[PDB]
Amino acid sequence: MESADLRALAKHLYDSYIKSFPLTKAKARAILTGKTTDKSPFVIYDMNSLMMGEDKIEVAIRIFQGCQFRSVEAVQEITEYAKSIPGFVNLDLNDQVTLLKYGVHEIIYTMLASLMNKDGVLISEGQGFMTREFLKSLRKPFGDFMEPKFEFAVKFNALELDDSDLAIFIAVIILSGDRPGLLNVKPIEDIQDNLLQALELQLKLNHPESSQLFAKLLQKMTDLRQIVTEHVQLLQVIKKTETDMSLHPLLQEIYKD
Amino acid sequence: MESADLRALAKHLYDSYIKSFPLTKAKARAILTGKDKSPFVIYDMNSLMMGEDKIKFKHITPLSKEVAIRIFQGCQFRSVEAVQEITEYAKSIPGFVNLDLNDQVTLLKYGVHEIIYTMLASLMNKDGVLISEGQGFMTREFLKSLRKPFGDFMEPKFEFAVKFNALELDDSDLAIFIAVIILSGDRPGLLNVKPIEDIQDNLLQALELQLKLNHPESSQLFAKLLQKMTDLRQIVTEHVQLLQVIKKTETDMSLHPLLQEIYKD
Ligand SMILES: O=C(O)c1ccc(-c2nn(C(=O)c3c(Cl)cccc3C(F)(F)F)c3ccc(Cl)cc23)c(OCc2cccc3c2OCO3)c1
Ligand SMILES: O=C(O)c1ccc(-c2nn(C(=O)c3c(Cl)cccc3C(F)(F)F)c3ccc(Cl)cc23)c(OCc2cccc3c2OCO3)c1
Secondary structure: OOHHHHHHHHHHHHHHHHHHOOOOHHHHHHHHHOOOOOOOOEEEOOHHHHHHHHHHOOHHHHHHHHHHHHHHHHHHHHHHHHHOOOOOOOOOHHHHHHHHHHHHHHHHHHHHHHOEEOOEEEEHHHOEEEEHHHHHOOOOOOHHHHHHHHHHHHHHHOOOOOHHHHHHHHHHHHOOOOOOOOOOHHHHHHHHHHHHHHHHHHHHHHOOOOOOHHHHHHHHHHHHHHHHHHHHHHHHHHHOOOOOOOOOHHHHHHHOO | OOHHHHHHHHHHHHHHHHHHOOOOHHHHHHHHHOOOOOOEEEOOHHHHHHHHHHOOOHHHOOOOOOHHHHHHHHHHHHHHHHHHHHHHHHHOOOOOOOOOHHHHHHHHHHHHHHHHHHHHHHOEEOOEEEEHHHOEEEEHHHHHOOOOOHHHHHHHHHHHHHHHHOOOOOHHHHHHHHHHHHOOOOOOOOOOHHHHHHHHHHHHHHHHHHHHHHOOOOOOHHHHHHHHHHHHHHHHHHHHHHHHHHHHHOOOOOOOHHHHHHOOO
């Protein structure tokens, strides 16, 4: 509840966010808008370019497993970031697990948007770019599993957040006192209140011409909760057809309840 | 013409050290020496069962049921919090945040073990260790008597602590010492050693002056303190080898994968 302390917290979370995540939104936007010369991605738009892409950098399964593997790495990255949020590690250890269990998916979607435009998504640390049309054209259940990520990303990216905004936003999501099964809601909400104050000041200073960006950003936490539910529900259905798939135990545990 | 600058740097680090760490050495010594508000003492299984039911130690609450495992992991979890505390303290060392971000991460990664040991001695005497911000006191004998490898994992910390505490450092000494450890130019993988050593050279100057003024009767205390970095590197190395033996033999260490992720380092 002090401006300079709120600014200090924003700088702390931004700095830690840079340390925890390999590919920032700033880097991803430089790659996506191009204009540069050797940060240029190889573009995978069909079966044959995928085959060529392996030498430079079932098709639907291999792409799914590529997402699963990246998602697991994201969980690791998010987990390392979470420990830097002031107060998180001091919480009851079961609550730490619970907050990560229910928060990682919402964060993955958020940060996935940083890697997307309307035409595709960066992969392999920005070295490749896989087109939305190719992903949507994958077979049976896999195509319609890829596309909702793009649907969200386009809407979310219209807010034009930069990384210093996202670092606080991601922190706010993690410290959600309403997660099922929390033992100690009060210290979680005390931390989130500081993060919320920090976010509000951040958005007012960094986006002063963007009216009610704070409220509009929080209304996006609504769209996240819905899409994680559809994702989980659709992911389970895929399990009932595809035994040539298996989830990483880290993800397997997260989805269990 | 920089005596006053070293005092300023000394005071700056002392003030910041007080803000970052929960239980100071000065406070911890009053408790250990008995100088009212007496900590709960854990000297065996039944007293542990009572203290976790009364005081509710956060690192020793069920989340394995085996007591020696639960105490081992409780140390791990407290070490995780200490890392964040040291990380926040590091940001206050003049020049640290201006270093290359990868080097900041590298220095913290390879220093936290040495610092946690150093600061653990503050909470220790020859008879046990303070826990939960001084609310509990777990005896050396109870820790040393734990089964299989866990007992022999606890006791080397006390052996180091007893020798380190004979230097009789206070918090104003330790604040500079901890900073010197952090700014180690020989950590593997550093990108830009020169500014790291430039800072350590200032911190070393401040530590030397601090020790002469604070311990004028303790000859070559500076040299003796730097010689303890030998004892630190050695035991951190031994510590790593002891953890791997525990990991490769103990089938009862399963935790939720998220928790394993938090504790990964
Ligand atoms: O770099 C990243 O930060 C990142 C993050 C997420 C994906 C990605 N996951 N995903 C999932 O379903 C998913 C999600 Cl959201 C959350 C949890 C578990 C899963 C799982 F388990 F079910 F997957 C996607 C679906 C579609 C798209 Cl477009 C991307 C993702 C990510 O994807 C990079 C990527 C995209 C296409 C092909 C790839 C690839 O990496 C290698 O090959 C990056
Ligand atoms: O409050 C503190 O400032 C503190 C600091 C350290 C410990 C503690 N770590 N530990 C380790 O092995 C260890 C060490 Cl040195 C360095 C790096 C990583 C580790 C790790 F990761 F491997 F742990 C100990 C071993 C024995 C003892 Cl005695 C204490 C420590 C500490 O421990 C307090 C504590 C907390 C909960 C249960 C306890 C307990 O002490 C006994 O039971 C506090």
